[PDB]
Amino acid sequence: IAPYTMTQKDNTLFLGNYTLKRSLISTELKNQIKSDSIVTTILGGLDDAIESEWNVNTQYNSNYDLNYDSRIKGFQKGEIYRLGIQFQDNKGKWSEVVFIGDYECTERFKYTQYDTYGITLIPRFKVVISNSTTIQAIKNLGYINARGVVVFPTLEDRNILCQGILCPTVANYKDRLDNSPFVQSSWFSRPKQATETWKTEYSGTNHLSEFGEVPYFQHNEPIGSASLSEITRWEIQTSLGLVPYYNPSTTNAKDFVDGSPSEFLVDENIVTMHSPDVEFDDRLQNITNGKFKLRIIGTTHLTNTLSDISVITSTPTYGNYATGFYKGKVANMNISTSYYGGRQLSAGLFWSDNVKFQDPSPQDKLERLWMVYPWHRNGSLMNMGVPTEGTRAAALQRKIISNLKFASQNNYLPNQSVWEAEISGDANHTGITPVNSWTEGLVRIPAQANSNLGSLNYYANIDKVLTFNRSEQISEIYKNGYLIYTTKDWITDGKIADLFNNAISQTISVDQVQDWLTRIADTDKYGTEPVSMKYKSNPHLVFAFNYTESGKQLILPMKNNNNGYLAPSANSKPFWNPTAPEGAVYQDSINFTNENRAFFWLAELYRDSVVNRFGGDTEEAILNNTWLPSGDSVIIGDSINIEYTEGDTYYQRYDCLRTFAYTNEDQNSIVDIVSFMCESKVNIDGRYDKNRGQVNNLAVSPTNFNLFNPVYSQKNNFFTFRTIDYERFSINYFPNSITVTKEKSLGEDIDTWTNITLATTLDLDGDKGEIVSLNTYNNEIFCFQRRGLSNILFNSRVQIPTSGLKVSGKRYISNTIGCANKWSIAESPSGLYFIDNETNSLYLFNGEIVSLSDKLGFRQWISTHNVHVNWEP
Amino acid sequence: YGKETNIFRTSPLLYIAYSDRGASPEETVSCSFQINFTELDSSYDFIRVYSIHRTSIDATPTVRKVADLATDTKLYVDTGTTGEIVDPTLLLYVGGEEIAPYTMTQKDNTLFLGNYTLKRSLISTELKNQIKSDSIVTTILGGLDDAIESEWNVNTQYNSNYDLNYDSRIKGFQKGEIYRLGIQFQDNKGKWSEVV
Amino acid sequence: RYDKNRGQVNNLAVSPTNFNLFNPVYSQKNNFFTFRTIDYERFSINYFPNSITVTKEKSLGEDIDTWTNITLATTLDLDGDKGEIVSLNTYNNEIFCFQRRGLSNILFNSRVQIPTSGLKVSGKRYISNTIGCANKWSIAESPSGLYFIDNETNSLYLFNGEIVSLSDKLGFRQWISTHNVHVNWEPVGYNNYRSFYDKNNNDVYFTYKDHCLCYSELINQFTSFMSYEGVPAMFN
Amino acid sequence: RIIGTTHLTNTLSDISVITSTPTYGNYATGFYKGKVANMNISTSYYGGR
Ligand SMILES: [Mg+2]
């Protein structure tokens, strides 16, 4: 401030008629700075740059970025950021912001997991100003340093809504055809495979079950099969692999589905996006038909899978000396063995009991091995059914399976090969139905364009009982029920691990055992009881690709023209769409060769058109915006080189609990997790539960698994600034105003006089005049004004003047007499001698004003020697 | 540092609800209201925004001072975070009354005004009756600015006709009902006259 | 309706506890700003001669001018059996109100406890229940006090804490008793007096249509009958 | 006074059956859920059903 006069009472300083010195920047220089800014996007990192804590010699490494600074933040590649720059004075006072423009990022995050370490690259903007004239002007304004300052986008003006994997869905034959569920969320995450060498693995003795099972991920491939060469893939027990295609000349849709109404098909035309924003940001769990566009940006490098199994039976084993639940080895491998990526624990020989013969012999110490599927029969794990004497033997009570696919790295597509669902002018590439957030219940997906079907119906909390209706349509042997699969021979020498491993080869149905053609009853070799399907899911986003202009289905593309959809035979139509074109399916391919393992198509939902992003690009919206700091302060030398270190986007590990148990006492439950790296505006590493990176994952749930502490997702909100208009008139002159400092502590701290806060101001009457002078006489401050004289009450005792440091109101002594030339004031023991030019007198204040000129006869001398110009040396 | 006009405009009632359902009495909603200014009086330095918030029926609302915006801005979105919770009773003291005083003083930066006449401008009964005779009132079938609700289609098992994403102008009039109608007039300040 | 059991095919466990839950608040009218009819022939008064409004202390910050915002929320009414509020004046940090037959001191921003050895407008304090000015324009503010001419009492007073009749003290009772009229002052035709003050020489001019009586605070005596009559304004 | 009608187009129906004792047939199916009226508004002919 620029005051005009001062006093001093009770170790306190007064300052009156002060001007607030605000140093602003001219619009010309602001525009020159905004023209001279050479802004670019760079791929920078942290000072360490090598994360040796993470290695491929582990089943799981949690990329934890909370041991570092908040400079871990980067910038979303396809996002618009309103950038700026500040300048610092010699004192540390930061100037206003200089808006330099709205600029789009051009570099993505990049994490590469090497053998013994990993390197994460954080995209950062970089402003370069080299015009020496502008720099010299900035220096002439008293500035030394500079800093990056940004306005981050809100959820409404964001281009990208979120980023996450795409999961195929599943649908029961009956229910597609009754639309009661149509499409429904999968128990299991179904990733695509990079090659077709797994098809030859499921033939003969090539497939060892310790590698893990690749799920049924093809588009219309039924979830099941009759080929024993791939028996470990069977996810449901009442499934016979009926293709979802029928000849309309032969059979109706109903009669065709009635051969296997409890069969499921996969559906990549309707996917389920899983991002951390939906689970952690509750604003994305309420979307209702959000018009967005989809683009697949990258893949996930699946390397291993953490699987578990648990079997509890209500009744004991049939064999009195039986083993019972046997736990084999499935997929529990480190990241280094990356070939067996995207593989699960689906089915296997998880049981071992004697055989239920017509002539019962539980006394034998021999043992077969029996198949146990995810959704298993509501009965005995071994061969039994319709017990004739009471309860069943080895009856199932509670089985549950866990899986945690670990994506150790994400490989992002080149910009050319990025896949856009909607390409204008392309008949095949139609768009995406309005996005829908599933939280608890029913979600009607809107109608998909170029399809005479209606609006589809979707459920992710399934409480279903699947029944096998017996018929000879698929094969004759199914007029008695679904077969029971066991090992070809008994456990020969205690080698139950090798026999478990070679389940693809050493497996045969009970009836086909040529030695057991007459020793087993018809009721103890055919299974004819339901399957209890029960599982829940978490919040997510579900949408659907629109049909092509020809009427076909638009589908997730296939990498390197590998592992395509199930093509229908000639003249065969889908059972949910008899009036479909030939083929009824369209799938494109992405030529990506940097991915050689299983993956999930990593996509981003984006809004193409965004009007008035930050309120406007006009100076007003920028004035109405709230800015945030970004980066360290650097010195201004021959050039200004800023680096925006802190943004709003993270790059952290997200464990998506896709599926969990409907109840804790149901027979068949499934748990499915997909641990992968993703970008988010929410700090995913603020998760505070210890159920991370464990192989059990059996009792996990949204009550335990994804607990979150929001506070770590905090911005630099404390110190915030904004733009100012140079041409705007905001006053800085207060002639009738008195500031008051704090009483001097006279201790080892700052000088309170030098710290002016304007927090104890006092304004005198403005219709008398400006504060010409402030003076103190006999413990009391008296203020001279151009046409006034007052007494500033300060530190007067509370109650009586005479026979608490708060600056009380003023007390006016004369509303018409006041000094106009401060320099005619002389302090003395007797009073204050001042000369008022307006009244043409020489006064003396000693409690009462006395005109000495009139008393002693000097009126003429003063009336002839008065002038308006103030004193100056 | 100067004058203040009366409330020249009040928006229709806006519904703080979800895009597909209502909100329970105890739920907070993630909504935001876009205010589009057009042809403002640039002579004024600022334009002020208020928000009368009702959480029940005929309850004391919660008035909030949203912002003190410049008069040359053309858009503002009101997130519920920012704003000072002012007393609801000072929405009647905006601008104030119009008086004809007779003498004045000035103490402690305060103004006194004595022997004052309250200038109330009324309308004559003759003009009221002429307005009531000259009124040609009729009923029309109008709609909203959109006039096409593409969200609802016959390709669904059920579409909920949801009218809370729009203004309170969704309201109409019962066909066989009697309504006592009227009309007001506004001064140059934004003060609304009586009803005719 | 705020329940999510809407438009679902199950509808098996629905009940009035779940299905038709309701939030009444959305059924709200535009009740905040409401008006009503008024009768033109009805007599509702709008004239308050004995009434003083008080504005808020000027913040002197970037907001409205409190003086222009009149709310009538801090009113104060003087006694009506003396007369209307002819003039309000301030002298030495205190407001003094002239009435047609009264003179008061409006207590405002006096410290709470003792006058001498909290901005609320406390009650009035009457100085004289019978002396009061009737022509506002004969009032002149000066360091010494308030020179006003009361036509009813036929005197030329000076208030400096205590009322002093200068006309009686200095012998001007007849001159004022012969030059008094009831019509108020107005610039076209002078009828009553019009008081100014020369701040540069402490001279007070009680102007009239045919004379100008001058008074000097330097000697506390009248000086002359100046030829400054019929002048609408005289100021510093 | 009757002023108008309602354009019925579809009906959302459901069914649930729970039995205390099991089925008589040891290999029986039990509760079978058929298709009834769960259609879109476009198929308006089967309205009020
Ligand atoms: Mg193409």
In short:
This is part of a larger assembly, with four copies of chain A. Chain A has 873 residues and is mainly β.
Classify the oligomer.
Answer: part of a larger assembly
Tell me the distance between the termini of chain A.
24 Å
Q: What would you call the shape of chain A?
A: elongated
Total helix count of chain A?
A: 10
For the largest sheet of chain A, list the strands in their spatial order: 13-20-29-12-9-33-14-19
Helix-strand makeup class of chain A: mainly beta
Proportion of β residues of chain A? 25-35%
Helix coverage percent of residues of chain A?
A: under 10%
Question: Could you say which small molecules are bound to this protein?
Answer: magnesium ion
Number of strands of chain A: 48
Q: If interface size is counted as residues with C-beta under 8 Å from the partner's C-beta, which chains form the largest one?
A: B-C, 63 and 66 residues
Biggest β-sheet of chain A, characterized? Answer: 8 strands, antiparallel
Rg of chain A, please? 41 Å
Subunit structure (chain B): Homohexamer.
Protein name (chain B): Muzzle protein
Organism (chain B): Bacteroides phage crAss001
Function (chain B): Forms the muzzle assembly at the distal part of the tail. May serve as the gatekeeper to control the ejection of the cargo proteins.
